[PDB]
Amino acid sequence: QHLVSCLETLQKALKVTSLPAMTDRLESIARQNGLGSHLSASGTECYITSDMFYVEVHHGENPVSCPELVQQLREKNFDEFSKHLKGLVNLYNLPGDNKLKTKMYLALQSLEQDLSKMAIMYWKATNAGPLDKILHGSVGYLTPRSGGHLMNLKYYVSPSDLLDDIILHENNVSRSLGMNASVTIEGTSAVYKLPIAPLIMGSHPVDNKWTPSFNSVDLPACFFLKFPQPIPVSRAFVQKLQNCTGIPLFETQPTYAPLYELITQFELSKDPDPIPLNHNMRFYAALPGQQHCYFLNKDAPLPDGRSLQGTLVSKITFQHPGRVPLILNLIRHQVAYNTLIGSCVKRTILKEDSPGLLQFEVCPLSESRFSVSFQHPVNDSLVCVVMDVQDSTHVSCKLYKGLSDALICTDDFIAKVVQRCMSIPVTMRAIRRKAETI
Amino acid sequence: TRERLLSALEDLEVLSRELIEMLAISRENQVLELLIHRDGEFQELMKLALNQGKIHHEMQVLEKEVEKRDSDIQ
Amino acid sequence: VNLKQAILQAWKERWSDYQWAINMKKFFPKGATWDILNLADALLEQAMIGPSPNPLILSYLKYAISSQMVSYSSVLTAISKFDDFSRDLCVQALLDIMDMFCDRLSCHGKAEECIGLCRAL
Amino acid sequence: FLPLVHNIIKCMDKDQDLNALKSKFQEMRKLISTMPGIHLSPEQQQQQLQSLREQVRTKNELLQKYKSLCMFE
């Protein structure tokens, strides 16, 4: 009986005819997502579950006539409307009970208002362009929740990916054109105290001031900062991040292997192909001038004697937004280091390459530092460029050479070329070219 | 082509009837996929079916004209 | 041709230490005990350039000490010529390398090698 | 055709026998839609048109040739 009901949504989804049958297609969408449909007149039909009730013509007014939803329905995109309902259902997958669910949603609304105000304060203090806000701003470019989609804070926009095939952001910044993190309430086994009303009642003109808790209630949930693709993070970052918040980042200690392997998986899996690369940590890179091979050297001992080890993090839980500015600054840092080392990872088949193969390599000297070692471009001794990722957007590099050697490069010229475009497989090219030009 | 259209029509009717009857007995993605595939076949050759008839009427007119011309020539 | 070109012809294509030993033999017919050619000097230069040493060329030097390719005297001189001292990681690597041979500190050769070991100590 | 089939499925979801009989009559109408003057493909339709055009042109040309042919000075 229930399978025949699910059976009819499927054949009603392939049904496509006039407006009457398109209203029956909206009824199909309801039972497809296991929703309940009540229709008053031909014009208004309402899908109702919990507080997730919306009408195409609980505890809150109908918020907005979203152009997004209206445009999709007016045009022939019932599939897009189906995705939007799925997003709404996932947001309210909240367990809780009833009165607790309404309060828990209220807490999310307070957090959203506070985060929005904090973003506004940064714009008032400095009229920064969207790119500056995303790369180095309090919170991040923030899009308020629309329908199912929850608030997205853009932590970082990599220089290579800002450029597509020299994009100027404008206020039209795409939702996925960068690295994005979503803020949401999710149920937890433990019990926590969360603000149930806006906590930025009084705001100090520079930065923000939060009125102290209790209002608040001990709901069995915490605010979350879910990342759409899990970000590989190192053990040292877990300690640096914990120092501020205090909430255990990984709680039940799971697995923790070399970080460089996880960085390769994240980069390789961005574009999926059937054949596994089988890199053996010897990625080959082809560039406009010269050919390079990079050995990532995981398992090199750090000063402690343990190889850099880290575990993918998808959800970070924060009670209030006070520790959020500090947590984001550490993340920004972990993400930037991953991007520079990530730019090298590539799925190429450089086999039997006699010319060039100007191989470069990478050893983990310490958490937050790595050394790329290469033969001197003009002379013969091994030379290297470190890149400690001090901050998300800032890397400091020192090119030590032997006592008798040819001045390979000026640290500033390399920086100018990298900031113009970017990528670190790219940084090694600039070091080689500058040395050769001299 | 006529044969293909007739076969598609028969398949569609039987399978749609079977799916509806199973829904009725309870209170079928294989059937659904088959339906949409032959529905595309019928619809794409239904624009053709309409025009074909108009073209056939035009052809009949042309034939009449040719016949007259020949008979006149003879 | 040069030892610097071989040591990274060894670092480039990832060579394990014994394959480095074989190919280092093959690149140079006269062994010259490897200390006339200053193996320890070239390995320390192209290992201690970065803030942290690359573990490949340190693995090459630790094999070239543990296997008796390189005398302890040339290693102790090449350790002595490093200083810089702003980097603790390179200094800790040098102290682990000294922790390898120290105490044994044994020369089985000519007496000039023993005098060289004395000056190197 | 497909709309009528979907309407029959909707009637089954609501439930009738009369509607199924109507679907059978629609299938008879479909057999009529297979042959209300249907008999040819898109290619054949193109060849027949070209042949008819060529025939009209040749007949008109022959008639004009004898139109000019004036037997009386």
Nearest CA in chain C to A362: C54
| Whole-angstrom Cα Rg for chain D | 26
Nearest CA in chain B to D48: B59
Q: Does B6 touch chain D (CB under 8 A)?
A: yes
CB spacing of A11 vs B19 below 8 angstroms: yes
Task: Determine the distance from the C-alpha atom of residue A58 to the mean position of all C-alpha atoms in its chain, rounded to a whole number.
Answer: 32
The two tokens of residue A15 are: 């049904």
The two tokens of residue A113 are: 């208002």
CB spacing of B23 vs A4 below 8 angstroms: yes
Instruction: Provide the β-strand partners of residue A309.
Output: A258
Query: Resolution limit in angstroms?
Result: 4.2
- Please give the Cα distance from C52 to A363 (Å, whole number): 8
CB A259 within 8 A of CB A364: yes
In one letter, which amino acid is B14? V
Instruction: Provide the β-strand partners of residue A287.
Output: none
Instruction: Provide the β-strand partners of residue A195.
Output: A216
Q: What's the burial of B54, exposed, middle or buried (CB within 10 Å: 0-12/13-18/19+)?
A: exposed
- Please give the Cα distance from A184 to A197 (Å, whole number): 16
- Please give the Cα distance from A434 to A379 (Å, whole number): 14
CB spacing of A8 vs D3 below 8 angstroms: no
CB A360 within 8 A of CB A374: yes
Give residues after which chain B gaps, C-N over 2.5 angstroms: 27
CA atoms within 13 A on the CB side of A61: 3
Q: How far is A15 from chain D (nearest CA, A)?
A: 7
Residues A32-53, buried b or exposed e (16+ Cβ, 10 A)? beebeeebeeeeebbbebbebb
- Please give the Cα distance from B1 to A413 (Å, whole number): 71
- What angle separates helix C55-66 from helix C3-11, to the nearest 10 degrees? 110
- Please give the Cα distance from A311 to A298 (Å, whole number): 15
Nearest to B28 by CA among A14, A338, A306: A14
**Length of chain C in terms of residues written:** 121
The CA-atom distances, in angstroms, between A435 and each of A305, A371, A387 are: 35, 19, 19
The CA-atom distances, in angstroms, between C11 and each of A27, A172, A383, C75, C99 are: 66, 47, 12, 20, 24
Backbone angles phi, psi at A153, to 5 degrees: -105, 125
Residues A349-363, buried b or exposed e (16+ Cβ, 10 A)? ebeeeeeeebbbbbb
Q: Does B34 touch chain D (CB under 8 A)?
A: no
Q: List CB contacts of D70: < 8 A, sequence separation 6 or more.
A: none
CB A293 within 8 A of CB A285: yes
Reported as type and span, the H/E element at residue A294 is: strand A291-295
Instruction: Provide the β-strand partners of residue A45.
Output: A39, A56
Q: Which residues of A touch C89 (CB under 8 A)?
A: 303, 365-366
**Chains A–D, number of C-beta pairs less than 8 Å apart:** 15
The two tokens of residue B40 are: 């595309």
Q: Scanning the structure block, which residue is given the tokens 């400690």? A: A388
In one letter, which amino acid is A79? D
Nearest to A333 by CA among A417, A411, A250, A393: A393
Q: List CB contacts of A239: < 8 A, sequence separation 6 or more.
A: none
